[PDB]
Amino acid sequence: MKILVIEDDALLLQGLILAMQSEGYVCDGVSTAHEAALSLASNHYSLIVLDLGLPDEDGLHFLSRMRREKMTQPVLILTARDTLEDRISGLDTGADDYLVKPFALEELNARIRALLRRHNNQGDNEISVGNLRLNVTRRLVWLGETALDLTPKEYALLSRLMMKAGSPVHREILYNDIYSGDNEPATNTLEVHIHNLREKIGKSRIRTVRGFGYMLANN
Amino acid sequence: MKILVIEDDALLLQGLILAMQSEGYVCDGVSTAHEAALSLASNHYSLIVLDLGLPDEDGLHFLSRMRREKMTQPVLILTARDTLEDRISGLDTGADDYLVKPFALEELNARIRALLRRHNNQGDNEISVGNLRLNVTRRLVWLGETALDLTPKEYALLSRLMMKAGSPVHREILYNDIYSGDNEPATNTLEVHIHNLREKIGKSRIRTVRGFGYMLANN
DNA sequence: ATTTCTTAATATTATCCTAAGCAAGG
DNA sequence: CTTGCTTAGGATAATATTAAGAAATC
Ligand code: BEF
Ligand code: BEF
Ligand SMILES: [Mg+2]
Ligand SMILES: [Mg+2]
């Protein structure tokens, strides 16, 4: 990923850039709030490091702005201010960790590591075949791109046939996918709800499997 | 927004629990790894807090199993084991922060407030859906120009609804979000309380999704 | 001494099922 | 001639809506 580092001390700033590289992050770094602003506006950064002791504009105000400016990225603070209130206020200004100087480098490498692992998979499990985009995580389906009203039975069938889409699903799989245990119905609802899915205005992407079951369209 | 607090020092444990409540979270404190684990199975937690010094099993061991079983929950260790080898080893295991004992409950409130600012929504408050301004730190919701008089459960429910806004939030979520452990109510609590949020002007901004929980709408 | 929560007992649907006839697969 | 399709008022289980008397909370 791409880290940006921010340090008023030059010897330090280089030491960091180089360290962040030893670990293998593509890394830029700067000694000015202004330049930090220009580089943020320039590139994409997965993580920021900071100092509150910036010479041009105070770091806290820069963070205040950065998120006020609706740039939301993880921001680690690495600072000389170990005052309790400083930890507090920083952490409350949108700062996702606070590391006091003097510090050990392997710690900073770990805190950054953890911050990034959390940042890393925010990914939503998704399945889209055709117009349909099924969101396993959001429980949102889209005949692309529009809302799909789905009763729980409808959604269960759609996602079972979406997950297996294109290779015919056997009838018993779909039946059980709907009513658990004592809930088992006597007649003709598999067909009723398959009918309803087909009636979504999405033009029958279900092909009927003659022997047993039903299948979904592919391309 | 219901925390689990895991500790084996009694006095401290009750204190933490009562403190977490004191901020407006809801909490289940436990004394050990098995209790913790079973408590993971049953309920749904916004954040957990961990101790390594448990008599049961070592907090880390549990964190390895937890996070290896793909429990994506944000952990925050807090322990009496301060060595740098300890914190790096803890973080890599791993936890989304670590804080050493002793400490000010205020640093803990700050790091947690932050950690959740990260997890649930991205970056910073305020989450704003439609005209509603929801500020995580200030505990206040605003409808357009004005504010709302929101009961605690009202604020928490609307909070979890705006966090996930645009997506239907399952019932069990809002439930576990409101009620801590022993305080689980037996009747109608959801629908009534939601009926009150709804009756607070802005209806209908909450779509009931049958078979599921309730969704918020931004368009 | 207000304010906020929980309990029922209520009233209102949304979603599933009831078959029973009509389409075809084969 | 067996297997899937379509048709709805009508049963079911889910949420809505109350109003009052518990708890909290001041
Ligand atoms: F002066 Be900075 F906080 F390192
Ligand atoms: F005793 Be525990 F590790 F704080
Ligand atoms: Mg400085
Ligand atoms: Mg301990």
Author numbering:
A (entry chain B), B (entry chain A): 1 to 219
What's in the article?
The PmrA/PmrB TCS is a major regulator of genes for lipopolysaccharide modification in the outer membrane of bacteria. The response regulator PmrA, which belongs to the OmpR/PhoB family, functions as a transcription factor. Here, we determine the crystal structure of BeF3−-activated PmrA in complex with the promoter DNA, which also reveals a REC–DBD interface in the upstream protomer, but the interactions of the interface are notably different from those observed in the KdpE–DNA complex structure.
We reveal the crystal structures of BeF3−-activated PmrA in complex with 25-bp DNA at 3.2 Å resolution and with 26-bp DNA at 3.8 Å resolution. The PmrA–26-bp DNA crystal has only one copy of the protein–DNA complex (complex-3) packed in a different space group, P3121. Complex-2 and complex-3 feature similar interactions between the two DBDs, with interfaces of 303.7 and 284.1 Å2, respectively. The interface interactions identified in the three complexes are also similar. Similar crystal structures are obtained from two crystals of distinct shapes and space groups, growing with different lengths of DNA in different conditions, which rules out the possibility of a crystal packing effect.
